[PDB]
Nucleic acid binder design. Structure first.
Ligand SMILES: [Mg+2]
Ligand SMILES: [Mg+2]
Ligand SMILES: [Mg+2]
Ligand SMILES: [Mg+2]
Ligand SMILES: [Mg+2]
Ligand SMILES: [Mg+2]
Lengths: 63, 64
DNA sequence: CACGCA
RNA sequence: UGCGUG
C-alpha cells in the first residue's frame, strides 16, 4: 500500500532527523504505529536507496 | 500438529539416514512435500534434541 | 535468501 | 530475535 508506505517513510525520516543519533527499530515501531515487518520493508528499501544506514543490528541512522 | 510433525520427522530421518552425508534443505523440501517453514520448525527442534546437525547454512546431517 | 521467530 | 525474503 503506497500511501501507507509513504507515511511510514515520512515518519521514519522525521524521527531519525529529530534524533540526530541512531534509533532502534523498537522505537520506530512505536513512533510509526506499524507492525515491525511493515517498517522493515520500508527501512531496507530506504537502505538500498542510501537514505538510511544500519549502524548496528536493527539500529538506524540518517544516511 | 503433532501427527503431521511426527511424520515429517520420520521422513527427515529417512532422507538423512539414507544419504549417509549432508543434505540440503532444498532436497528435504522436495522429499517431504512440505513447506520450507514447517520443515525448518522440525529440523531446528531436532537439532536441539541432538538428532541432526547443521553442517553449513541450510544443510543437515544425521546425528549430533 | 542463511530464516527456525512463537 | 538480528528477520527485510517478494
Ligand atoms: Mg497523507
Ligand atoms: Mg502415521
Ligand atoms: Mg546473509
Ligand atoms: Mg519456539
Ligand atoms: Mg543471530
Ligand atoms: Mg525485493
Amino acid at each position: 500500500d503506497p500511501g501507507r508506505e509513504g507515511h511510514l517513510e515520512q515518519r521514519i525520516l522525521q524521527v531519525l532527523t529529530e534524533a540526530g543519533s541512531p534509533v532502534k527499530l523498537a522505537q520506530l515501531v512505536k513512533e510509526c504505529q506499524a507492525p515491525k515487518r511493515e517498517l522493515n520493508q520500508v527501512l531496507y528499501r530506504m537502505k538500498k536507496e542510501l537514505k538510511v544506514s544500519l549502524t548496528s543490528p536493527a539500529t538506524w541512522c540518517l544516511g
